[PDB]
Amino acid sequence: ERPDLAWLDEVTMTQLERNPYEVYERLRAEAPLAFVPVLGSYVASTAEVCREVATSPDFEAVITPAGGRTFGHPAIIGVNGDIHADLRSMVEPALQPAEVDRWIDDLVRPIARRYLERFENDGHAELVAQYCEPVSVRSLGDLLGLQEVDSDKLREWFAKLNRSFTNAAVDENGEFANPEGFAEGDQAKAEIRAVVDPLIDKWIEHPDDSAISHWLHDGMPPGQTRDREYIYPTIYVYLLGAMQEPGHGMASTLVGLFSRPEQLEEVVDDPTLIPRAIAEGLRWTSPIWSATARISTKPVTIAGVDLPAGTPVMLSYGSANHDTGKYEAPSQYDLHRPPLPHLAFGAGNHACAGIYFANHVMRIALEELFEAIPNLERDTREGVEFWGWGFRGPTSLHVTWE
Ligand code: HEM
Ligand SMILES: COc1cccc(OC)c1O
């Protein structure tokens, strides 16, 4: 118990979900590594500390308590050594840049057009549900082999898994404050199994181009497949973050550009600026804000704190990307910010494996949107509300045109 941080005792989970920025602005100044009682964990809040923990030889991957309750073992994000190496070898082939470039265009662009065609002549839309999330899940779902799971269902799954994974509040004793908050996630996993089990049955006997078929078969001895219980936790990882984050990234990018109308106009007139707009969007509101963690494997001193071996540290990358030691006025979206390293994809050997793919999905989606609707205007009838501490993004993005 750190005396000068006694105010952290009164920080609530709801506060952090609704708006973590004021608390984390204090943390970055007072204690870049600090134990947050309601989270039951140390959290790293600055760019220097997050990067150090994520790349340190004295830390390894771990899942948070709520995250482990949600995904089980072996979730690619929470394992190390030979298991992690196998899971990385499993997912990396379809994410290799040279491979992505072979097909990303023909994958994403027809999908973006299909969802645009449903509303581009309406003069109003809610872009999160009508465009950003559907493009994100349909693109990845087709790649995975889930062509027959409609986008409504994929979006419901990642929303349920998100809430379950981020169900992190703990009581004074150290147990979960909402032990009922995992039930929704359990139901999503059961629905996922009902859909994927027969697909796995088929792929074992009849492999095809779908990523999950390749997860079963790639690198295995002849006639063998990875056991479904061995790959399911990484399937869940995909059906949460991989499904959710590209849509949140493009939506937050749009919110940011709306907040700088001159910059929105710039990007519409010159869509070669879209990659830069997206990189700034991810820094400005990081889709994975504080979901992942590491655990120390030996005593280590971090930000003046002597940590024993076995100490978990939550990586609040969304706070690190507002580090005022790194950025000028980081709370503002600025397309013309000098390109600088950011931590929205994490760091170290557990950094995002899908960066190149994710950036193209978001790029192609915004290219088609601005081409279809050059005169997008935000519905200023209300402000944009963001939600989430673990994962963060706009809950809706109402716009008009014409
Ligand atoms: C813009 C959207 C995305 C963002 C912001 C993003 C950000 C991340 C972050 C922060 C992590 C954790 C890194 C750490 O703890 O240091 C991550 C891990 C990962 N992401 Fe991405 N991700 C994104 C889209 C994807 C997509 C679409 C895929 C799959 C196609 C993907 C596959 C991964 C995988 C497999 C891991 C686990 C890597 C490991 O633990 O070894 N991500 N992502
Ligand atoms: C906490 O859950 C996650 C963390 C990082 C990446 C994920 O999906 C790729 C993901 O589902």
Side-chain angles (χ1 to χ4, degrees):
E1 293 177 350
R2 187 172 154 169
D4 56 302
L5 300 187
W7 60 267
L8 274 177
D9 288 356
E10 308 301 325
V11 165
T12 67
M13 197 68 228
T14 294
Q15 170 181 20
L16 293 177
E17 289 162 349
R18 170 172 314 156
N19 169 29
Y21 303 158
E22 327 306 331
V23 167
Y24 271 85
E25 180 176 58
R26 292 310 303 190
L27 292 185
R28 287 193 308 275
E30 300 187 44
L33 185 72
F35 190 87
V36 177
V38 74
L39 298 175
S41 182
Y42 281 103
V43 315
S45 54
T46 61
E48 172 182 350
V49 174
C50 281
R51 181 177 181 170
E52 184 183 7
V53 171
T55 62
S56 167
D58 298 324
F59 281 83
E60 68 180 14
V62 74
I63 316 197
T64 60
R69 172 66 177 75
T70 298
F71 288 161
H73 182 276
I76 189 169
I77 66 181
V79 298
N80 300 287
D82 290 347
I83 294 164
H84 183 241
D86 182 59
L87 291 172
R88 288 293 294 229
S89 80
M90 185 179 86
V91 300
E92 283 176 355
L95 301 172
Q96 194 196 18
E99 174 72 16
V100 172
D101 289 333
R102 288 175 187 113
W103 41 254
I104 187 69
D105 229 274
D106 294 342
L107 170 65
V108 180
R109 216 174 283 281
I111 281 164
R113 283 301 312 155
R114 168 158 140 253
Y115 290 112
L116 283 167
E117 268 160 17
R118 294 175 176 187
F119 64 82
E120 59 187 1
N121 302 118
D122 292 354
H124 61 82
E126 193 292 278
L127 291 181
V128 174
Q130 288 180 258
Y131 187 67
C132 297
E133 291 190 355
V135 177
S136 187
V137 307
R138 186 71 279 137
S139 292
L140 178 61
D142 289 1
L143 186 77
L144 288 179
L146 306 176
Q147 289 89 341
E148 298 311 303
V149 185
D150 62 324
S151 67
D152 276 4
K153 177 55 68 176
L154 296 170
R155 294 173 48 233
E156 168 186 342
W157 285 346
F158 77 60
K160 283 179 162 48
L161 291 170
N162 169 334
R163 303 306 189 109
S164 179
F165 191 102
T166 62
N167 185 36
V170 296
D171 70 14
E172 54 281 0
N173 308 120
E175 183 65 13
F176 294 117
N178 318 101
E180 319 296 316
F182 304 110
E184 218 170 45
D186 289 354
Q187 157 196 348
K189 286 172 286 186
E191 292 183 4
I192 292 168
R193 295 245 176 174
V195 163
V196 174
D197 272 346
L199 292 175
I200 289 180
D201 289 347
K202 173 193 68 178
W203 288 326
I204 287 172
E205 310 299 318
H206 300 100
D208 68 6
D209 298 327
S210 73
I212 293 171
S213 180
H214 282 280
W215 295 6
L216 292 165
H217 289 273
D218 282 0
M220 302 293 297
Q224 307 188 12
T225 52
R226 294 189 174 75
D227 192 82
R228 67 189 72 205
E229 300 299 330
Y230 176 79
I231 69 169
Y232 258 124
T234 294
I235 288 172
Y236 300 156
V237 167
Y238 267 58
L239 293 184
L240 204 186
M243 288 286 174
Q244 172 177 255
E245 297 332 306
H248 282 194
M250 49 189 293
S252 289
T253 296
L254 289 161
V255 178
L257 289 166
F258 283 127
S259 80
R260 307 293 300 275
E262 69 284 359
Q263 304 187 344
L264 172 62
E265 186 181 21
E266 256 192 278
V267 177
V268 167
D269 291 332
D270 183 1
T272 66
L273 297 174
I274 278 168
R276 184 81 199 90
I278 288 161
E280 169 66 355
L282 299 181
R283 183 212 62 79
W284 175 68
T285 307
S286 303
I288 297 193
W289 208 92
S290 188
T292 62
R294 303 297 193 270
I295 188 171
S296 66
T297 54
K298 61 193 233 148
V300 283
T301 299
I302 299 272
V305 182
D306 295 335
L307 304 173
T311 302
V313 173
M314 279 161 182
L315 292 168
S316 303
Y317 291 133
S319 165
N321 283 331
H322 283 208
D323 196 322
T324 47
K326 256 179 89 179
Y327 303 106
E328 302 312 317
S331 64
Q332 175 193 65
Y333 180 95
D334 185 2
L335 175 72
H336 303 297
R337 194 176 300 282
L340 291 177
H342 67 77
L343 286 164
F345 294 115
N349 67 332
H350 277 262
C352 180
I355 298 174
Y356 194 84
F357 169 91
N359 283 335
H360 277 311
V361 169
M362 291 181 289
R363 165 187 69 86
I364 295 169
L366 291 185
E367 284 180 9
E368 291 298 314
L369 176 65
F370 297 147
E371 234 174 271
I373 313 183
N375 57 340
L376 267 179
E377 284 175 71
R378 195 177 79 75
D379 192 337
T380 309
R381 170 192 155 199
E382 312 176 59
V384 181
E385 151 183 313
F386 286 76
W387 185 91
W389 161 80
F391 302 95
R392 190 162 181 83
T395 62
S396 67
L397 178 49
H398 289 96
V399 302
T400 68
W401 67 95
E402 276 187 319

